[PDB]
Amino acid sequence: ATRLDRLVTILETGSTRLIRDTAVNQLADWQKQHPEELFNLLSRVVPYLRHKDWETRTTAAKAIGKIIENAPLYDPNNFFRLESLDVATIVKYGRPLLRGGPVDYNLAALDPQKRLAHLKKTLNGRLGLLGRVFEDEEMPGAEWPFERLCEFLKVDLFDPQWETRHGAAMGLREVIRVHGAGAGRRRGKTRKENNDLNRQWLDDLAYRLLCVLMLDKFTDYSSDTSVAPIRETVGQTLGAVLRHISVESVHAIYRLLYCMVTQENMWAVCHGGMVGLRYVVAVRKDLLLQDGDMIDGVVRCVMQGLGDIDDDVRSVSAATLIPMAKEFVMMRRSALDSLINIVWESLSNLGDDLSASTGKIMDLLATLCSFPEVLEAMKVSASQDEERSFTLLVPRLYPFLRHTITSVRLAVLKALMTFANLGGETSQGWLNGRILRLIFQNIIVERDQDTLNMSLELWTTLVRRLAARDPAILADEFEAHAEPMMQLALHPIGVPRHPIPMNPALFQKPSGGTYSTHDVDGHMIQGEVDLVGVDVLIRSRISAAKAMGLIMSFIPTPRLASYDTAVLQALSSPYASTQLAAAMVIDEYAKNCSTPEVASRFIEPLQKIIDLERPSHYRDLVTYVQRVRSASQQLINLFRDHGKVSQGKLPTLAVVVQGEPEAGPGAFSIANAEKVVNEDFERLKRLMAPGQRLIALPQLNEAREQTVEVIEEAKAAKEARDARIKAAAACALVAMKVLPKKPSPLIKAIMDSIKTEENQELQSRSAATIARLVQLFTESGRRGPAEKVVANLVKFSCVEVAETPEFPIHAHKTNVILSMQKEEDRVPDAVKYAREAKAARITRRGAKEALEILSKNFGAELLERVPTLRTFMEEPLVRAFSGDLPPEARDPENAFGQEIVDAMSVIRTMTPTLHPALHPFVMQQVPLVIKALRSDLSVFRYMAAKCMATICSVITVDGMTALVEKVLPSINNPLDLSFRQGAIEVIYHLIAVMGDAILPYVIFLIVPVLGRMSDSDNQIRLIATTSFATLVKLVPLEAGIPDPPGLSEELLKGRDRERTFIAQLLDPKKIEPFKIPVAIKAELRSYQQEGVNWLAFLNKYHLHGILCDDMGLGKTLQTICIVASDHHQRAEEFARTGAPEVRKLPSLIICPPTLSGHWQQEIKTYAPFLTVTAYVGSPAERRAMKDSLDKTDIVITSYDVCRNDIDVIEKYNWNYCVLDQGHLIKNPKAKITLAVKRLTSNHRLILTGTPIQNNVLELWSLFDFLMPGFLGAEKVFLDRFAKPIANSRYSKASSKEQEAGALAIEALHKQVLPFLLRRLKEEVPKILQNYYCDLSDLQRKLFEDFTKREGKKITETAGRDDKEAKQHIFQALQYMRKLCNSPALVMKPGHKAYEDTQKYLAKHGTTLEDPIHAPKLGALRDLLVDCGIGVEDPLYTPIKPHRALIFCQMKEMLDMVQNTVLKQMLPSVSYLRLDGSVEANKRQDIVNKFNSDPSYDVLLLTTSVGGLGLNLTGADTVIFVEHDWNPQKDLQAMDRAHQKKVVNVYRIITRGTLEEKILSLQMDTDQILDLFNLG
């Protein structure tokens, strides 16, 4: 179908959210550009409000919201009375609205308005306005635009089908939200007349809305989100009406809602009334706060609802009071004390498993407990009554600890925190072992990190407040729960596809019994490693050990005998997960003791783990070993079936594997499988015939390597467990200050974790340990092992090649910028190259954090306590950059080169976390790094730029001052290439390190960056252009940019040339006017001169952009202005300075071959002082001017002759280079695209009506011609922009991939926006215009042949005024006016020159119907592509801005226009044709489709049918191909067949013919005779 039908149908079948939301923005954009198509888009999304699917109704209601926002508000300068509403009659006599099964077919087939007129009679009865229950056998721009629509919605509010009532309520919500004020008004009345007419209409809707709250009994028990889907929604619609009605109408709605709550019960009427009151306080809280009578009644309603039996009534009641919980506490402290215990009463009846709706009750209690006033009034009631003591109330919060909503579980821990920080007299009846167990259970099973943090923070205060009383009391309350809680802290963790479930009987409910929108903690209690991340289970054992470690540090040691037996037993457990957790509990116990000697009884069991050998198997890794046996067996079974080997020679594998329970010492192990692939694969290969081996060995080698894959997979899995347990035991020893005599094995255990540990929390613990171990050694001599540890950390922070280059690999590179290589090289993908690179990133991550923690432990004493660090960072730079570079530093075999690289690698690794007292040491090294930026070796310049950028981001005062004073001023220097490459590179890495923090410092960066895009070195141009693109992306468009804090006041003074640039770049309306210095013959409009200001701004700062002005605004003139002015201005400065950058060079204008004459004509008209060469013609003609093109000011060239003669055109240098329809360059691989990019030009422009289509790669190719590096190379552009965009558009894409693809669209549009000048023709009388085209060779031949015969008699019959003489002259003019359109109109069989013409067409090898002989056909496709109509899915393609009418006089011409232009040339255009041949009945059909479906681009028709009174509205442009002798007969048929917008009228006229002469003349004999002369 059409675009609009396919675009709307996506609302139903949008597979992802991104695909559905993209369709609603297309419809919203379609309304924004074509505001008159409002009721064509709405009449297709409104039917989707009755859809049987929930999301389709939601999406369709969303589109109505977006489409209506793009409609102008309506200011024109049978109703219901809200007061006369009786609650008793409607509830009693009304129609209960239920889930609707019945469908009455007799009504369904009625006229859509007769169906509506019938439902408006039945409505008064169904509402109960009669004294009886109504039964359906009694009855078997002048005004508001949406008033006809709202009748269908207000009537469908009571349809038996609950799906229809759902969509009708959402539709009314979106219409009244944007357009609520104008409803009801009618043109022809004063403000006071339709202000109350609006009040009556809004009261009429509120009347109907309250009825739905009373009558709707529908309830969906399936989902826990919404219980009353219609009452929840129709109350949301009531909120949109409240923000538009008077204060008196609100107080009337308030009383009617008050009767529904305090019914003077019934669940539905009480709930629906509360829902309405919920939005009254959330929308009109201002009006509610003066009238104290409303404040009392709305609070009386909440309190009754808060004590109601049903849970859903208490939820909406609590959600009503939250927005004014602060406001109600202050104003009425008398009612404050009664509100507290009623809220507390609501939580008392609840069990442990709470519905998702009950979460709003907790939100109400949490906001009340955040006020000190409420906390005091509770203590007064606690000292007075026993039933309000904290022992009976607080445990009512425990069922909320494991609530389904994530935000509720955090609000409870924050609330329970408030009670622990309240009093000692107050909070001890509830603070016991019962709450300690629930919190410890919360630590094991909580998945959210913020909630797990508060659980540990509450566990600390709960333990410390209870240990302050007596350490024996704390140990008694927890002794009853200590035994099972230990089994959960030491519980093993499984492998993906091998979950180790926890015993659910070890979890006590708040009810007291054990476990034996639900299943909140079952995924983790089951231990699903795939469903919940492997790192989430690990950080739940870490949190367990940290909790269990703190509680043990307070219990007296003699009563910890049961705890030690559990952990000593766990150190020898067959589960590696348990041994790791066991050693971590000992660690956190020794950390929290006052002295480390208290825990010194664990020294011997832990030193066993370090010194003894590790077990060769673990029970948690049994799945890996079982997987190894399968591969080993299939490898052997293949040695039997595929290769013919006897069963007796085959080895036998054990059926049970090691680590399994009840596994003998002869079970299957990894060592057995290593013997199968290493020694039995060889032994069994000797037992094959040399003929059998040749056929079977292919598939055997494949089976062998698949086995080794799993073998090395299991061995790596076990060695990871050996390192985890050894490192955890060593860290606990370091906590007990265990400094061995021979510390090599202790240090190795901690180091092996820092090298290889995928998990960050386990690695960060080992980094913090090795940082304290360095401090413990330097605090007691032992500088031997202390300086070897720090030296390894420094070595490990340089292994990631992405951060620290390998010097011998790049040692030979000079005059190269490695920053460009690093990104143009990572776009390599091999499994064993990405695994080794992953190990390097892990090793650096650990070592970097160890030095970070080391720098914070020693503070400002880091360089005095650890003097080896100062040597690594300072010594190599002093040797190499104090004076001349030693020749040793250039050799890749010498280690000196890498020592210099590592030195600067450590500086940027530790500068951020360095104590501010060590910044002078870094500043001492700055003169050495600047010396490296100037170096000739590129790898030194690369690291110097990364290092300096980091230093400037930390020491923002002196670091920036050094860069602006010592580096930036010498980017101009044309003698030292190496310093320029280094200085632009430190700018590149400065923007990358700081990010959007670079904003205040962009002042100092902008001029060196801009000027470097105009540099002789190609690499500096590219990296400066990429830098400039990142700046445009990172600026705040709407806000200003502050000044650099703390810098010199004299640095910011002389930099005002750089502030006017940034101001003009953000806002294009602040561009300085440009007085054209050449004598141009033109009246420049407000926008034309404004557009020339934009082109001069680009020329001034060496920028390039696209001129996207809509057709008619005159893009050709604005370009001739700027190129004539530029040639003049650079003719003056070349006379002043003679610099090569302003030498005389010709400009180049590339256009489609049809527009070659159009440019040549308008330069002749507006700028007659510019000499023009037209390098277009036959290959023979082009070769004369081929060698002489620089001898003029402008050179015009077609895209076709630019490919064949590119070797000629690139031999020249060009000033300007304009592309008249530049979208032909969008193909990056096209030959025309590559030829245009081989040109050396100074200033570039692109002229298009459409800048981009659906693809983003089209946009890259255009911007790659303008500013080469602006979007990067093609491969780096396909990565950051094209890959995520294409992935989010996948039918089944991830929710992360959707936002990754949406952030890229938004970022790509921001980089390219300041370089596209897109001014609409309409927003900021119909315009006639002439489109000129040139005659063809055949037309000139046929005109000359006519005047040779007929021209003799034309002189006779010209001024006769005779009878048949005026008939001969007229039909002689008809022959010419037909020939001006197409030669095929006049060259028909029977003509005297037919046989001669066919010879001419044959000698040149063409046909008569060839479109090149009728230039009006070619001029029509160019006029259509300049209006965005024709281009060379409805979803991703943009909305076309115009629709056209195309008029012709003859039916034969329309066939050419149809079969040639719209079928061969522009096949993507949707069109309809209208002839007098078509039936007068069928022609009315397609005229309707043109006004009902706005996706018809063009309507072809002849001027005969246009005068038939048919009226069209969607037309925006009108084109005339053929013309009548009376030029107003064309004006009649146009207006007769046709306002808000402006209409563009185009006359296609061949220059030099009678068309240019007839249309000019507004008859004398000699003036008639001149119609037969060309020119």
Residue numbers in the entry: 2 to 78, 108 to 170, 308 to 431, 438 to 689, 728 to 1038, 1041 to 1537, 1543 to 1650, 1656 to 1761, ...
Authors' description from the paper:
The single subunit remodeler Mot1 (Modifier of transcription 1) is a Swi2/Snf2 enzyme that either activates or represses transcription in a context-dependent manner by dissociating TATA box-binding protein (TBP) and Negative Cofactor 2 (NC2) from promoter DNA.
We determined the structure of this construct (residues 1–1836, Mot1∆C) harboring a point mutation in the Walker B motif (E1434Q) by Se-SAD to 3.2 Å. The construct covers the entire Mot1NTD and Mot1CTD domains but lacks 50 amino acids from the C-terminus. The CtMot1 enzyme is a ring-shaped protein. It forms a ring-like structure in which the substrate-interacting HEAT repeat ‘arch’ binds both lobes of the ATPase domain from opposing sites. Lobe 1 of the CtMot1CTD contacts the C-terminus of CtMot1NTD via HR16, a small insertion within HR12, and a ~ 45 amino acids linker. The tip of subdomain 1B interacts with HR1, thus lobe 1 effectively closes the ring structure of CtMot1. Indeed, comparison of CtMot1CTD to other SF2 enzymes shows that lobe 2 is flipped ~180° from an ‘active’ conformation in which the ATPase and DNA-binding motifs would be properly aligned, that is lobe 1’s motifs I-III are properly situated in the ATP-binding cleft, while lobe 2’s motifs IV-VI are situated on the outside and are fully solvent-exposed. Although the precise orientation of lobe 2 might be additionally determined by the bridge element that is missing in the structure, our structural data suggest that the auto-inhibited resting state of CtMot1 is stabilized by the interactions between subdomain 2A and HR1/2. The bridge was almost entirely omitted from our crystallization construct and the only included residues (1822 –1836) together with the C-terminal expression tag are not visible in the electron density maps.
